[PDB]
Design a protein around this ligand. Structure first.
Ligand SMILES: C[C@@H](c1oc(=O)c2ccccc2c1-c1cccc(CN2CCN(C)CC2)c1)n1nc(-c2cncc(O)c2)c2c(N)ncnc21
Lengths: 163, 918
């Protein structure tokens, strides 16, 4: 209605405690990376919003350039000043070519964010594979420790095995 | 030192050319106009002062850059892109809104992007409330503004010493004798007659924003008390009320159907394919299950698992309490355990409406811990902000009526809530000194508890059955007519066990008695409790904001407690919104915090330079390479001239660059020294470790010092400042004129002869008493708090004689957690006895001090327990479970009597004296 020797059990307490501590360190490494990568992903997504607002301002400027230039391109054409129109339109082309650089820069960040999003999921997967081992090694350590406390082993002798 | 900047003119024209990073915006605008004249459509532009630059700042917001004395490197635009726009409209709100975003470390657009009514109504209500108080502050007088800005720093509460008085502008000073117990109106009158040979002036300490005024005597001020005890003469200044104004200007119970929910789908799960996924679920109120924990059927491990299951609980819809939370947990079992993630959800919303429709809960990852529970009901209700990457569970609360249904009002609850000597003897035994039989007894005698046992309201709330709506209404009926409890009891009611909104409201109602002095002692604890709050708009948040607007110092420390956890995703939203409201109601202090932020921003970059240089080059070269980075115009101006984060009355004026340095530690702590018209002040900028642990300990030592000082016992402690400012970053106050024990010793009379050099002749007998008093206090403090890992490297002594401890890494038994014994070092006992092998008279005083100290803390033992209990919110490893709180119960020995506890303390004292020789 409800078994090895004490020295042999204490040996296994030392082994299982070492295996637990190693896995505890390994998880703390992966959790550090999980913490770190979460900050980096947020920064990247905040930077993409910045890219968007930058590009938004450039597109507002392109709207301003087309609306404002309608009056003066016509006026300089009447006065016979085709050279002033050439300055205006080439400047607009110089504005447009800069956007292509900023748009190209935004795409690189989006691709790094895609690669870093995979790594986040890969780390979290590696964490969730170790949790079974870590939780079980905590339980096993505790059960052997409680077994020896029942058997009546001194606290000083348990500390040697735990270390 | 140069960068190519895109310029966008309001005619649509685009200029592009290099400028220096150190060059300010006003200078940049002049170079722009000089190149704009050689580009089309120049004639149609107005003058440069008609326009203002706009950039995209680091938080991805447009910022109208009104202050053109800012350097482009200090502005920190995302890409080097400036755009000219019209300098008109409501520029006041525009300037503040952008300056807030940078200051809090979060863009205000991120609050808008959520499209959340709860957020928008918080912003609406709190900003309006805060703006009104700031307006009302300005209409009020100069004396009241002085109370707000520069509140009285007093000691916890007959001689005739000199005092060097001065006036604003004049170089001459006046030294003359004045008594210790005089009221400062008299002190001004004496100096005012000396000017010729009252109510329109106020006194001020030199090189400080600490003002002497009000009904209190001169002895109760910290500046005076420090000057009397040390020996030096107070140096004051007489400021006029005009100069102060210059600073001021310049139905639910119907629906009896059982509760249920549709578990639809999971998203973005990352687990081992061999296993199968299970969704554990359960309802909660505080840290108590309302019903059984329902579980789902098993599905194979993929990214997008599907269930589509009904999950019926054993509780009715009518029976649910106000603060009911559906707590989830995603696991990974084997078909015939692994916690992946968890998420909590409040059944009723902030407006009291029961939630319906689909809810996409973005889950938090599960950490394995010593408890190892199924669910995590103590966790935050707010969803994970990393939405696109992190996992989630699609669920759906079903419809239960044609129209929606609310949780009943206070009126309707009161209506439902209405209606021997043997059992009364049993109630005494339970409360004065809980099991299932005791719970039903107390609930039966709940009316007698209200009448005869007001202090045990907390006990009555736990025994109440929150899963039955009948029991809830009866408890709330009693609560709304419950008599006002003291501070000490009210602090207990703020804990995670008491989630109910009426209970919180009662707890805050009792805390309105707090003085600003006493509130400051519990401010850290009160900040941490906000993690347990469910909704954003709450009484504790309002209470904290009320006091911050009332008192500038409280507001200052409220800012940095909240700001320092903006990196933490679980509180970034909640804290960010409070910091917004605070900022709007204290625009004057915003300017101060902006200097502090940018000073701290440079010290990070300065520490990172020193960290990289320490690996490559040696220390003497790196120390010189540090000063070059400091001496640059952007770095020097930002670090120079600001109020200290550690104490905003203290003025950090001139950076003494040559005196600055760094230690060769794990995290390489910077040592910044200052000098101002008073004398010297220093700080340590630590980046790498978390300083909350060290702060909490220093706060509790400071609390002991106050508690001892209230009982007529000044143990000459050194509770120096410690302030977390950010992500593993913070300042720490330099205790000047001091050194570590290791550096002094590196034998028998090592510390004794150190005191002889620093206190020769008559001062020696004073410094020993300073040592004896201080050592006693720190012996008792470290004992009670359970502080291990003490040694020569982390213990210090001042030149005046006071010993003090530093850098508290571990406490409450931890190092595995065992009882840390009482520790008396042979070297300290040698100094206490004045170089003698046996000196029973002096050692008996020292024994007396440690006993008197220890007894005083037992009288206020519940305070320490209640405060430490609330700090569990902070998620410190060494202060997590109830056994950590138990350490304090045993060390103070509150279960035992005052005689019994003191007899046990003497045995631990006597055993420490024996262990000193060994
Ligand atoms: C260990 C010492 C220290 O910490 C540095 O980080 C550091 C960095 C660059 C250089 C020295 C240092 C020193 C240091 C070491 C020996 C002697 C002196 C005095 N010196 C001698 C030269 N003499 C010319 C000037 C005074 C300081 N130290 N740590 C803390 C401290 C750190 N974290 C948390 C905390 O709760 C306290 C602290 C404090 N609150 N108050 C005072 N000292 C303190």
């Amino acid at each position: 209605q409800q078994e090895d020797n004490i020295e042999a059990v204490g040996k296994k307490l030392h082994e299982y405690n070492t295996q637990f501590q190693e896995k505890s360190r390994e998880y703390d490494r992966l959790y550090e990376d999980y913490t770190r990568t979460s900050q980096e992903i947020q920064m990247k997504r905040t930077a993409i919003e910045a890219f968007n607002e930058t590009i938004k301002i450039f597109e507002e400027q392109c709207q301003t350039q087309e609306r404002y230039s309608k009056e003066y391109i016509e006026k300089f054409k009447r006065e016979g000043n085709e050279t002033e129109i050439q300055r205006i339109m080439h400047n607009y082309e110089k504005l447009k070519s800069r956007i292509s650089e900023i748009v190209d820069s935004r795409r690189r960040l989006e691709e790094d964010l895609k690669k870093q999003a995979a790594e986040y999921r890969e780390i979290d997967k590696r964490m969730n594979s170790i949790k079974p081992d870590l939780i079980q090694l905590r339980k096993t350590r505790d059960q052997y420790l409680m077994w020896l406390t029942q058997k009546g082993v001194r606290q000083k002798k348990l500390n040697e095995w735990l270390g | 030192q140069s960068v190519v900047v895109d310029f966008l003119l309001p005619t649509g024209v685009y200029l592009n050319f290099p400028v220096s990073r150190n060059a300010n915006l006003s200078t940049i605008k002049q170079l722009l106009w000089h190149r704009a004249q050689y580009e089309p459509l120049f004639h149609m532009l107005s003058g440069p002062e008609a326009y203002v630059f706009t950039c995209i700042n680091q938080t991805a917001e447009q910022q109208e850059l009104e202050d053109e004395q800012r350097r482009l490197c200090d502005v920190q635009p995302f890409l080097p892109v400036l755009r000219l726009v019209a300098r008109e409209g409501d520029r006041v709100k525009k300037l503040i809104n952008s300056q807030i975003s940078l200051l809090i470390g979060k863009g205000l657009h991120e609050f808008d992007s959520l499209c959340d009514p709860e957020v928008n109504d918080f912003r609406a209500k709190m900003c309006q409330f805060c703006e009104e108080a700031a307006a009302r502050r300005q209409q009020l007088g100069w004396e009241a503004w002085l109370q707000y800005s520069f509140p009285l720093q007093l000691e916890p509460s007959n001689r005739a010493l000199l005092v060097n008085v001065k006036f604003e502008g004049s170089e001459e000073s006046f030294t003359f004798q004045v008594s210790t117990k005089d009221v400062p109106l008299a002190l001004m009158a004496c100096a005012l007659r000396k000017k010729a040979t009252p109510e329109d002036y106020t006194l001020q300490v030199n090189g400080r924003h600490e003002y002497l005024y009000g009904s209190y005597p001169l002895c109760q001020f910290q500046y005076i008390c420090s000057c009397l005890h040390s020996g030096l003469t107070p140096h004051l200044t007489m400021v006029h009320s005009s100069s102060i104004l210059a600073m001021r200007d310049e139905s639910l119970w119907s629906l009896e159907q059982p509760f249920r929910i549709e578990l639809i789908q999971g998203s973005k799960v990352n687990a081992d394919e061999r296993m199968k996924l299970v969704v554990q679920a359960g309802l909660f109120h505080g840290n108590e299950m309302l019903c059984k924990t329902v579980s789902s059927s098993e599905v194979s491990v993929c990214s997008e698992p599907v269930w589509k299951q009904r999950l019926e609980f054993d509780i009715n819809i009518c029976d649910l309490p106000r603060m009911a939370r559906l707590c989830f947990a995603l696991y990974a079992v084997i078909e015939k355990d692994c916690p992946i993630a968890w998420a909590n959800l409040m059944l009723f919303d902030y407006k009291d409406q029961l939630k319906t429709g689909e809810r996409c809960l973005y889950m938090w990852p599960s950490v394995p811990d010593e408890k190892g529970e199924l669910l995590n009901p103590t966790g935050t209700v707010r969803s994970n902000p990393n939405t696109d990457s992190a996992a989630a569970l699609l669920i759906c609360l079903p419809e239960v009526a044609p129209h929606p249904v609310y949780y009943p009002a206070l009126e309707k609850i009161l209506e439902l809530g209405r209606h021997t000597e043997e059992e009364q003897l049993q109630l005494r035994e339970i409360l004065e000194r809980l099991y299932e039989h005791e719970k039903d007894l107390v609930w039966k005698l709940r009316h007698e508890v209200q009448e005869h046992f007001p202090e045990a309201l907390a006990r009555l709330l736990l025994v109440t059955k929150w899963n039955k709506h009948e029991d809830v209404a009866q408890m709330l009926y009693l609560l709304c007519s419950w008599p006002e409890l003291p501070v000490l009891s009210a602090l207990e009611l703020l804990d995670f066990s008491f989630p109910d909104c009426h209970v919180g409201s009662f707890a805050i109602k009792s805390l309105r008695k707090l003085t600003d002095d006493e509130l400051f002692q519990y401010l850290l604890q009160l900040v941490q409790v906000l993690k347990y709050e469910s909704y954003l708009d709450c009484e504790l948040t309002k209470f904290l904001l009320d006091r911050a607007l009332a008192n500038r110092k409280i507001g200052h420390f409220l800012f940095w407690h909240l700001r320092s956890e903006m990196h933490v995703p679980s509180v970034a939203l909640r804290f960010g919104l409070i910091l917004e409201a605070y900022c709007r109601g204290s625009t004057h202090h915003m300017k101060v915090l902006m200097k502090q932020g940018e000073a701290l921003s440079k010290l990070k970059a300065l520490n990172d330079f020193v960290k990289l240089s320490s690996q490559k080059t040696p220390k003497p070269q790196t120390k010189e390479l540090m000063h070059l980075c400091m001496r640059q115009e952007a770095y020097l101006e930002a670090l120079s001239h600001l109020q200290s984060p550690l104490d905003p009355s203290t003025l950090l004026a001139e950076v003494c660059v040559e005196q600055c340095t760094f230690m060769d530690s794990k995290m390489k702590p910077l040592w910044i020294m200052y000098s101002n018209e008073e004398g010297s002040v220093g700080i340590i900028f630590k980046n790498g470790d978390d300083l909350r642990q060290d702060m909490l300990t220093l706060q509790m030592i400071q609390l002991m010092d106050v508690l001892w000082k209230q009982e007529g016992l000044d143990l000459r402690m050194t509770p120096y400042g410690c302030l977390p400012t950010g992500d593993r970053t913070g300042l720490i106050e330099v205790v000047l004129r001091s050194d570590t024990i290791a550096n002094i010793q590196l034998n028998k009379d090592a510390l004794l002869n150190w005191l002889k050099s620093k206190n020769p002749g008559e001062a020696l007998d004073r410094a020993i008493e300073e040592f004896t008093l201080s050592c006693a206090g720190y012996c008792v403090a470290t004992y009670v708090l359970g502080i291990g890992d003490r040694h020569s490297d982390n213990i210090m002594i001042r030149e005046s004689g006071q010993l003090f401890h530093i850098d508290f890494g571990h406490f409450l038994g931890n190092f595995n957690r065992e009882r840390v014994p009482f520790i008396l070092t042979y070297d300290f006992v040698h100094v206490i006895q004045q170089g003698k092998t046996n000196n029973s008279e002096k050692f008996e005083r020292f024994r007396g001090y440690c006993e008197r100290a220890y007894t005083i803390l037992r009288r206020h033992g519940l305070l320490f327990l209640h405060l430490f209990a609330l700090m569990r919110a902070a998620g410190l490893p060494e202060l997590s479970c109830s056994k950590d709180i138990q350490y304090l119960k045993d060390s103070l020995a509150l279960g035992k009597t005052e005689e019994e506890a003191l007899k046990h303390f003497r045995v631990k004292f006597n055993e420490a004296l024996r262990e000193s020789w060994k």
